[PDB]
């Protein structure tokens, strides 16, 4: 019922399983196991997250599944298909973010213009 | 949980005979059953897993079969080393539960 909570900042992708509350959580990607001591890239699974490092669009992308300990890989609730590009530090423009920048810039422009107006007036 | 039972606690068979041991389950366990062999001195080893796949180092003498809720281990010719207690363990749902075991 509760979807995955994936927070993407910079080149590291972190995704969370807020569906199995208090059990050990494992991960599988493209039906291949990821996490758990594997030396490659040090993708270190923690209590309820999976932090990819220097995410690769072509190497690391596909179905991600979250099964609790004591449950088979095929018994998890639902898969997740994650297809993203990462940068060194790119940040998105949502509608609210663009509205914020438009408002703040028009405000500062008007304010400074009128302040110079008033100062020059006297 | 899932109560895992066996038909007979002990059975007797002569040397060189093909012997089968039955294990039942309270629910369907999706063939997620493993058979364990325990020597009388205390050491115990895994014979087969997933009801059909032998384990590395276990002789092909041991074969498992069955599906659903009835599973069976069919030993081939019985040597003297083959006398032991055999345990069947589920793997379907937590907690894992063993059975009483059969003394061969």
């Amino acid at each position, epitope marked *: 019922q509760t979807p995955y909570k994936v927070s993407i900042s910079g080149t590291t992708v972190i995704l969370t399983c807020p569906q199995y509350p208090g*059990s050990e959580i494992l991960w599988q990607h493209n039906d291949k196991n990821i996490g758990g001591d594997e030396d490659d890239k040090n993708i270190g699974s923690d209590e309820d997250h999976l932090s990819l490092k220097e995410f690769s669009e072509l190497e690391q992308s596909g179905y991600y599944v979250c099964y609790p300990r004591g449950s088979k890989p095929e018994d998890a609730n639902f898969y997740l298909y994650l297809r993203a590009r990462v940068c060194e530090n790119c940040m998105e423009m949502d509608v609210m973010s663009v509205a914020t920048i438009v408002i703040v810039d028009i405000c500062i422009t008007g304010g400074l213009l009128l302040l110079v107006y008033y100062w020059s007036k006297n | 949980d899932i109560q895992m039972t066996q038909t007979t606690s002990s059975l007797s068979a002569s040397l060189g005979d093909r012997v089968t041991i039955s294990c039942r389950a309270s629910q369907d366990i999706r063939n997620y059953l493993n058979w364990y062999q325990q020597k009388p001195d205390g050491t115990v080893k895994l014979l087969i897993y997933y009801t059909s796949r032998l384990h590395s180092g276990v002789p092909s003498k041991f074969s498992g079969s069955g599906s659903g809720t009835d599973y069976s281990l069919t030993i081939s010719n019985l040597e003297q080393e083959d006398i032991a207690t055999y345990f069947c363990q589920q793997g379907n749902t937590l*907690p894992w539960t063993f059975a009483g075991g059969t003394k061969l």
Partner: nanobody, 121 residues
Framework: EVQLQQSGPELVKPGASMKISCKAS????????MNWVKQSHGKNLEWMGL????????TYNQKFKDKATLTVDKSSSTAYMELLSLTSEDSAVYYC???????????????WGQGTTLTVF
């Protein structure tokens, strides 16, 4: 070869706490799940809980959640069970069983230890 070595008999007075050590060797200890099983009532085998050595987390059988607390010493390649409030019904042979890390190989115990015979009197 792969081998798990355990502790000895260690008779314990009732009411105490008794730490069982399972020393793993011959393989990457941080990559394989370790389980613990109990052989009481003559020959009946039961399961307590499994501890993930790399992360140190544990999942327990409902019966033994108040009876055992498991710790791992990653440096020495050992697993520890803490048996607290040791009554007379706790006297049995205790095995430490290895199994695969992930959900596809953690439901069968490939490598078993010799077992420690705990006697409580």
């Amino acid at each position: 070869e792969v081998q798990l070595q355990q502790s000895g008999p260690e008779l314990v007075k009732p009411g105490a706490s008794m730490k069982i050590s399972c020393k793993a060797s011959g393989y990457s200890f941080t990559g394989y799940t370790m389980n613990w099983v109990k052989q009481s009532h003559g020959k009946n085998l039961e399961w307590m809980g499994l501890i993930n050595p790399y992360k140190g987390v544990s999942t327990y059988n409902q019966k033994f959640k108040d009876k055992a607390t498991l710790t791992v010493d990653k440096s020495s390649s050992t697993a520890y069970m803490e048996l607290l409030s040791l009554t007379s019904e706790d006297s049995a042979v205790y095995y430490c069983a290895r199994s695969g890390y992930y959900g596809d190989s953690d439901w069968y115990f490939d490598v078993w230890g010799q077992g420690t015979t705990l006697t409580v009197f």
